[PDB]
């Protein structure tokens, strides 16, 4: 039971600063880093930096250096972000998540996420971004990186109302608790997800992400949909991204 | 240069009989059989039959016995089919197919089809997923093919684009038909089968279809829709999920 | 024996430039106009200018100057494109067209299209309607089309079919043009249009867009998709509908 | 108010007859006469004949005769359909209406349908049989008659839970309480019918009928679904044919 608890929405005016928080439950905080990221429904999910409780320390992708200033409160528990200069392109659901000690090692415990509204990378190419298929099939996803990253893309499911999920490490090790009709495979720049069985529950995002060295970075995401067959009976509902479920 | 010239559309009542047409050229006629498929459009393709001009042979699917007549006149190098006691549920395209006499491996070479209007058990089942996926030229996708029970390596693979025959891509699992590209790929033994397309490009966006072709009935995976992706957009838009009862 | 022959299709990054040709032969190259459209695949079409290149003018559609520069080349009779800055949102196909410089009715004469792919206000609309409708060969369907404002009777019919350039069925709401079988009529006037099709044919099932020329910017409804209809079957299954919130 | 109230589903097996009800209320039973319809999803709707119940005369389509018997009870203002021989062909809904007098007039009071289930005429070519469209849009359905009928053809809205509604009668004549946005057209053999100003509602089955001679014969139908856009909320939820409504 790790929890990462943050806080609420917010809505503010170009060029002023927000600061959201980000309080951990279930582990030592001064143990391990916290991780932020951004994601927008286009630009999928992007790495901000992580910050160390126990020695204050930060480490920023160069691409928000400035944009971002992580902080952590050692006597509460809280991680905390601040963004400055704040502009439309800003607009996006921001997660925090506990990193292993410093380690590029992805993580598996994200937060809930904050909507904030304004009012030499390896790049990863997922695909197909959008997929449907039955209960009982089994679909592939393809990831596929600009250089080596050896065997360490990660998979992850997101699922409305759920924190991000790990999948899938180090290119083909099955998370604990993962169905094994989840597998991944791949090493240097082709990498897939291989979904079986599927079931109803699988709708979701999900997202590949190297863990091979920093910058963190993100497949764009493929969206999954399941049939049910019109022969029976069942329920249509409606979920979106996780800036419009806020 | 082969042709299979198949004859025009039928708009016929039900309970007539149309004989439609495949008239070959390119090869040498009576030396290879004339295999006939059925397909509801942009649906489920099935394997009606074949036959064997020189001697006049004829094998069933065994579900289309007495619906289908298939016959040949060796001397003009046309073979026929023939539906009787027409239904709605025979409304569909038909193609003829150049078969092999050596292999079980399916041809390259099919008719463009004719259209039939009619208004006024132990077979290889294959499932075909994901039924539709977007994506864009120059990524991978792969395309997932599945039977019932194990049909060893054979299993082709056909891209079928609008206004063109059908295109074998791959036969027995993974071996390129002459003239395909390299990025065209297949995997797979017993049941489990895949299609990988790599550096897409605009023409491969298209229908694709599996077909066992390890024993009789051929039978063939649902189709599976290739097409270009929508760009995520920056504004509040819903997205759809299911259970039953 | 008109071609207007496009370049092949591109695959930029973001924040890139194109410059897409359009070759043309078989009439007099400076004596017209080009017209070009932005498409994205099976949705809405838009109509980006003209240039005409005895004297370079140029007739910008006002939400796309800045990103689309057009120019000519007389000596090779070849026109351009050149886009710019190019975002997710440039990723469509972009079509050019012979444009008449005594009329205001569109020609009949489009290129293939160029597919560009990028990754890694008192305007008149156009609503179609049905947007999707099934029938059979022999059957008569008609399509309708509104104006926002009134367009007189200045509205064109195009069919698109795969591998085919765009074909110009109907323009001022009923007059058909050359060579478009009889089958085929438009009416209406002011905002109300339709498109009627009797005795339908194989070749008919496809993509409609209707489109006002009677203004600039010229404006598209759509598109709506005519499909061979599914038999209504004899087993238990469902049908949908649906209201807000 | 008129209702006709007709009798619970029946599940026969083949070889034997059912006598299915319809029991009147609302006008004077022995006034007019009582039709009996037919209907499965694959064949649309069929005229079985009528029964005029003040006299007992019968009318029948000769494709019906023997296998259907019409009668009627004049003290309990019911009408009754035996059906015998009974195949798995004759499994489908089956409804009887009240016409007016013994004219050939379409009748617009339809009873909600009897469930069967065991275990030189006027043909109608009806098109589209499925369409989709959006709110505030406009539609036409074709109706295409292999002989003339003059302006005699009628247009019905069938929608899952009410009664079968007369919309359009004559060809282009309105009937009362059917709002103007439906209109009606043709002469002869070619006619339409033109929807505008879509509304949810206005999702269901469509069928036109001519109303020149016996036997009554219909189109085969047509379905309109109407769009949501994804860009709003809203719901989906199933309907069927009345074979699969019962
Ligand atoms: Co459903
Ligand atoms: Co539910
Ligand atoms: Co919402
Ligand atoms: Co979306
Ligand atoms: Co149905
Ligand atoms: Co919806
Ligand atoms: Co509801
Ligand atoms: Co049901």
């Known amino acids: 039971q790790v929890q990462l608890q943050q806080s609420d929405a917010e809505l503010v005016k170009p060029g002023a600063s927000v600061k959201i928080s980000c309080k951990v439950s279930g582990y030592t905080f001064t143990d391990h880093t916290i991780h932020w990221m951004k994601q927008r429904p286009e630009q999928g999910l992007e790495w901000?930096?992580?910050?160390?409780?126990?020695?204050?320390?930060?480490?920023?992708?160069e691409k928000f250096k400035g944009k971002a200033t992580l902080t952590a409160d050692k006597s509460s528990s809280t991680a905390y972000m601040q963004l400055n200069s704040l502009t439309s392109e800003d607009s996006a659901v921001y997660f925090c998540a506990k990193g292993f000690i410093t380690t590029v090692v992805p993580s598996a415990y994200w937060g809930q996420g904050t909507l904030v509204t304004v009012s030499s990378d390896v790049q990863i190419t997922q695909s197909p971004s959008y997929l449907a298929a039955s209960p009982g099939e089994t679909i592939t996803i393809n990831c596929?990186?600009?250089?080596?990253?050896?065997?360490?893309?990660?998979?992850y499911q997101e699922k409305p109302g759920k924190t991000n999920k790990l999948?899938?490490?180090?290119?083909?090790?099955?998370?604990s608790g993962i169905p094994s009709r989840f597998s991944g495979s791949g090493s240097g720049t082709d990498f897939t997800l291989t979904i079986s069985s599927l079931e109803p529950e699988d709708f979701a995002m999900?997202?590949?992400?190297?863990?091979?060295?920093?910058?963190?970075?993100?497949?764009?995401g493929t969206k999954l949909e399941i049939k049910l067959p019109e022969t029976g009976h069942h329920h249509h509902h409606h979920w979106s991204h996780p800036q419009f479920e806020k | 240069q082969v042709q299979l010239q198949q004859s025009d559309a039928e708009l016929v009542k039900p309970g007539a009989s149309v004989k439609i047409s495949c008239k070959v050229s390119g090869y040498t006629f009576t030396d290879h059989t004339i295999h006939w498929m059925k397909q509801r459009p942009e649906q489920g393709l099935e394997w009606?039959?074949?036959?064997?001009?020189?001697?006049?042979?004829?094998?069933?699917?065994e579900k289309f016995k007495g619906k289908a007549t298939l016959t040949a006149d060796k001397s003009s190098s046309t073979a026929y089919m023939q539906l009787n006691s027409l239904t709605s549920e025979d409304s569909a395209v038909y193609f003829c197919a150049k078969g092999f006499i050596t292999t079980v491996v399916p041809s390259a070479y099919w008719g463009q089809g004719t259209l039939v209007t009619v208004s006024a058990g132990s077979d290889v089942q294959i499932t075909q997923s994901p039924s539709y996926l977007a994506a864009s030229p120059g990524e991978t996708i792969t395309i997932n093919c599945?039977?019932?029970?194990?049909?060893?390596?054979?299993?082709?693979?056909y891209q079928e684009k609008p206004g063109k025959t059908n295109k074998l891509?791959?036969?027995?699992?993974?071996?390129?038909?002459s003239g395909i590209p390299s990025r065209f790929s297949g995997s797979g033994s017993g049941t489990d089968f895949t299609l990988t397309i790599s550096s897409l490009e605009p023409e491969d966006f298209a229908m694709?279809?599996?077909?066992?072709?390890?024993?009789?009935?051929?039978?063939?995976?649902?189709g599976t829709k290739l097409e270009i992706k929508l760009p995520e957009t920056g504004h509040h838009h819903h997205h759809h999920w299911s259970h039953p009862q | 024996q008109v071609q207007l022959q496009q370049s092949d299709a591109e695959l930029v990054k973001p924040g890139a430039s194109v410059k897409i040709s359009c070759k043309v032969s078989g009439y007099t190259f400076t004596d017209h106009t080009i017209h070009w459209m932005k498409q994205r695949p099976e949705q809405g079409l838009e109509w980006?200018?003209?240039?005409?290149?005895?004297?370079?003018?140029?007739?910008?559609?006002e939400k796309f100057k800045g990103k689309a520069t057009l120019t000519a080349d007389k000596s090779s009779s070849t026109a351009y494109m050149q886009l710019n800055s190019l975002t997710s949102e440039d990723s469509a196909v972009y079509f050019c067209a012979k444009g008449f410089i005594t009329t205001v009715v569109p020609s009949a004469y489009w290129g293939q299209g160029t597919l560009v792919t990028v990754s890694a206000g008192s305007d008149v609309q156009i609503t179609q309607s049905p947007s999707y409708l099934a029938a059979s060969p022999g059957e008569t369907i008609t399509i309708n089309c509104?104006?926002?404002?009134?367009?007189?009777?200045?509205?064109?019919?195009y069919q698109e079919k795969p591998g085919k350039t765009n074909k110009l069925?109907?323009?001022?709401?009923?007059?058909?043009?050359s060579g478009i079988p009889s089958r085929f009529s438009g009416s209406g006037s002011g905002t109300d249009f339709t498109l009627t099709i009797s005795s339908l044919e194989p070749e008919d099932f496809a993509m409609?867009?209707?489109?006002?020329?009677?203004?600039?910017?010229?404006?598209?409804?759509?598109g709506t998709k005519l499909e061979i209809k599914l038999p209504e079957t004899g087993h238990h299954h469902h049908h949908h509908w649906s209201h807000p919130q | 108010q008129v209702q006709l109230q007709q009798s619970d589903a029946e599940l026969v097996k083949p070889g034997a007859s059912v006598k299915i009800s319809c029991k009147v209320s609302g006008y004077t039973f022995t006034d007019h006469t009582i039709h009996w319809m037919k209907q499965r999803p694959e064949q649309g709707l069929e005229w079985i004949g009528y029964?005029?119940?003040?006299?007992?005369?019968?009318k029948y389509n000769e494709k019906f005769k023997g296998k259907a018997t019409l009668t009627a009870d004049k003290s309990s203002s019911t009408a009754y359909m035996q059906l015998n021989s009974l195949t798995s062909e004759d499994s489908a809904v089956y409804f009887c209406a009240k016409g007016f007098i013994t004219t050939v007039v379409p009748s617009a009071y339809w009873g909600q349908g009897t469930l069967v289930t065991v275990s030189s005429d006027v043909q109608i070519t009806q098109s589209p049989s499925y369409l989709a469209a959006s709110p505030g849009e406009t539609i036409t359905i074709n109706c295409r008659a292999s002989?003339?009928?003059?302006?005699?053809l009628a247009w019905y809205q069938e929608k899952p839970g009410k009664t079968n509604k007369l919309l359009i009668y004559?060809?282009?004549t309105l009937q009362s309480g059917i709002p103007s946005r439906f209109s009606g057209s043709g002469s002869g053999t070619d006619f339409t019918l033109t929807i505008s100003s879509l509304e949810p509602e206005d999702f269901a089955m469509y069928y036109c009928?001519?109303?020149?001679?016996?036997?009554?014969?219909f189109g085969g139908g047509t379905k309109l679904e109407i769009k949501l856009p994804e860009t709003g909320h809203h719901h989906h939820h199933h309907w069927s044919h009345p074979q699969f409504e019962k």
């Open positions: 004559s060809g282009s």
């Open positions: 009928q001519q109303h020149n001679e016996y036997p009554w014969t």
């Open positions: 002989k003339s009928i003059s302006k005699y």
């Open positions: 029964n005029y119940p003040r006299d007992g005369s019968t």
